[PDB]
């Protein structure tokens, strides 16, 4: 299951990975990072959502949010605020250089209005149907939650039932008829088992 020490420092690498284990062994104890408390309800940044960088090496650029870390209030954008690191290095070969992105705090980014490609501040609201949404403060317009592929990787629109995958018509069929009998009693009538012997009473203490 999950084995996280009390003051585990979250990072770019996922917990339990080989890189995180070496980085965060069970024994180390480091100063806890201070994170501004943000209500799960208030959080307004999700993966697949365009954001503009206010402060950093490359400010004023808009990019998609590929990853978000709630524990540290980090937002990762592809291709922006990126340094360079050699990947696939070996003892003989230097390795291949690639740009690696650096995490950004939720205060160093700013959401963009779909109508006007400019940074804007949003406040949550409710539509007619009652579904909660985020609306820009200036020139209020709806900003839906960008669709993002599932973590597991399954694409419902491209699913092929296998030999051990129940069909939709068999997994939604209703066969239950509310009664006043237990699985044991109901099964003994169907299987055909008969037991005439009685159960003598015991004492409980």
């Amino acid at each position: 299951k999950v084995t996280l020490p009390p003051h585990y420092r979250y990072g770019m690498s996922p917990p339990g990975s080989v890189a995180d284990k070496r980085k965060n062994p069970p024994w180390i104890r480091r100063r806890p990072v201070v994170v501004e408390p943000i209500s799960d309800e208030d959080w307004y940044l999700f993966c697949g959502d365009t954001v503009e960088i206010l402060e950093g090496k490359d400010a004023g650029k808009q990019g998609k949010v590929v990853q978000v870390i709630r524990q540290r209030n980090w937002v990762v954008v592809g291709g922006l605020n990126t340094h360079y690191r050699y990947i696939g290095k070996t003892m003989d070969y230097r390795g291949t250089m690639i740009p690696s992105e650096a995490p950004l705090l939720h205060r160093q980014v700013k959401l963009v209005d779909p109508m006007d490609r400019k940074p804007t501040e949003i406040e949550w609201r409710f539509t007619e149907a009652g579904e909660r949404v985020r609306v820009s403060t200036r020139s209020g317009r709806i900003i839906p939650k960008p669709e993002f592929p599932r973590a597991d990787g399954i694409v419902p629109e491209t699913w092929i039932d296998g030999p051990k995958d129940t069909s939709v018509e068999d997994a939604l069929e209703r066969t239950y008829v509310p009664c006043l009998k237990t699985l044991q009693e109901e099964v003994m009538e169907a299987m055909g088992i008969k037991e005439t012997r009685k159960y003598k009473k015991v004492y409980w203490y």
Partner: peptide, 15 residues
Amino acid sequence: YPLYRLGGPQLRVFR
């Protein structure tokens, strides 16, 4: 386990 006595039912596990 339901306790057994002489002349009692057979013990069965369904699951």
